[PDB]
């Protein structure tokens, strides 16, 4: 479990790895620009950091950057930047290709989406979403791209839509039961999970999951601690959520979801509390 970037009074350069077996934290090479509100993913075994923002005492620069971490070089390397800066981006990987979804640049909330090819180092625009979405959760299932929740600049969203690559088109699907911006969104086997987030009034601990075969969202066991802007990933068939903000403190808590008994429990404590991280596994 690798977490990159994040926010704790300023955007951070931390790259750290958590081990669910031995429970100890590995501290690794720093990002070559601090970022929060970024997304992380893995392609070809290399970890990509996508978008985000450097919120510092001397600036607040939205990031168009794409950069590559190699787990046995302990080295970061820059890749081609995106069309636009995307703070609070979501990403998903189809066929080893990078889809960058939504996010913001200043007051502009993107509905734009663009595709990166790792072995060509190229971005190009695809069809935009039906909705402008920042803090969108993104997941991939059955070679389809799902954009879930988010914020359009005015309303926070329970809607979700689906991208079909070979038709270049977005399809609205059944909305979530809960409005969520900055939730953790991932696949645990074959339910698209949406955990936590912010509905414009409170940070959430509720978790719900989408069943494609019935096009139904159903609620499962909620987290122990409400959290928004959390990282999320699935390891060994279990879901891990990392940090976030609960309206009062930047959480270092990390929770595990065991799907077969449907319970959450405290697994570990991050080295420092933070929100807005990028998380991925390799």
């Amino acid at each position: 479990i690798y977490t990159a970037g994040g926010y704790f009074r300023q955007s951070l350069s931390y790259l750290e790895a958590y081990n669910p077996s031995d429970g100890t934290w590995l501290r690794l090479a720093d990002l070559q620009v601090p970022r929060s509100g970024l997304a992380g993913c893995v392609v070809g075994g290399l970890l990509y950091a996508v978008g985000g923002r450097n919120n510092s005492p001397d600036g607040n620069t939205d990031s168009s950057a794409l950069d590559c971490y190699n787990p046995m070089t302990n080295q970061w390397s820059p890749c081609a930047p995106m069309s636009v800066p995307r703070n609070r981006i979501g990403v998903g990987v189809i066929d080893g290709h990078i889809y960058a979804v939504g996010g913001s640049h200043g007051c502009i909330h993107h509905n734009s989406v663009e595709r990166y090819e790792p072995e060509r180092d190229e971005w190009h625009l695809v069809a935009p979403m039906l909705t402008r979405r920042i803090g969108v959760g993104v997941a991939v299932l059955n070679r389809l791209l799902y954009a879930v929740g988010g914020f359009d600049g005015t309303n926070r969203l329970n809607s979700a839509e689906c991208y079909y690559p070979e038709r270049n088109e977005w399809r609205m699907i059944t909305a979530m039961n809960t409005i969520r911006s900055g939730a953790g969104v991932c696949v645990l086997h074959n339910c698209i999970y949406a955990a936590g987030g912010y509905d414009g009034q409170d940070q959430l601990n509720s978790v719900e999951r989408y069943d494609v075969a019935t096009a139904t969202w159903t609620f499962v066991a909620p987290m122990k601690h409400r959290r928004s802007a959390l990282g999320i990933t699935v390891h060994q068939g279990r879901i891990y959520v990392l940090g976030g903000y609960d309206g009062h403190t930047f959480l270092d808590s990390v929770e595990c979801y065991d799907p077969d008994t449907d319970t959450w429990s405290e697994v570990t404590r991050m080295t420092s509390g933070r929100s807005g991280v990028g998380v991925a596994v390799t």
Binding site: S36, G197, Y198, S228, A229, F250, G276
Partner: peptide, 7 residues
């Protein structure tokens, strides 16, 4: 600086 992310 906002309730969703803490920033």
């Amino acid at each position: 600086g906002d309730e969703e992310t803490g920033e």
